């Protein structure tokens with residue numbers, strides 16, 4: 001389920017998980033939204049060689065099962081956001097697991113919070129665009145989440 005999220009000057013795309021045989025359609029869906037980077041939060045699957053060749057960099061930072069992202073992944077994710085939108089204004093960052101496990105959306109949620117949103121509003125903003133956005137462990141994480149590096153001053 002391709003779902004797009006725009007807040008301030010940030011844009012994110014929560015995609016499905018393609019297979020090697022459907023990568024050409026996937027790449028053109030990404031380009032459609034001007035996606036220039038992809039973060040895989042679940043065990044690797046399709047081969048990235050082809051995607052990269054098309055100008056889309058793939059980042060593999062899996063969570064351990066449905067557990068909240070590690071501090072290392074949260075740090076790198078927030079850094080990616082900060083650098084990508086500052087070096088490529090207007091671009092889009094894609095993130096995905098399998099379009100239903102409620103893992104990928106947390107990353108978008110965290111970006112919204114650091115961007116100024118209340119975790120409550122960040123969750124409703126996403127939940128309204130798609131179901132199964134956050135598993136139980138995920139929601140609790142966001143509830144107790146305190147900003148580590150705000151986006152835009």
Ligand SMILES: Cc1cc2cn(-c3cccc(C(=O)N/N=C/c4ccco4)c3)cc2cc1C
Nearest residue numbers: 006007008009010117121122124125126151152
């Ligand atoms: C309650 C609620 C309020 C929302 C307000 N916007 C929204 C939409 C479009 C633009 C901006 C915005 O501030 N521009 N950024 C500017 C900027 C300058 C530098 C960096 O960024 C904000 C999405 C929302 C979603 C919800 C759910």
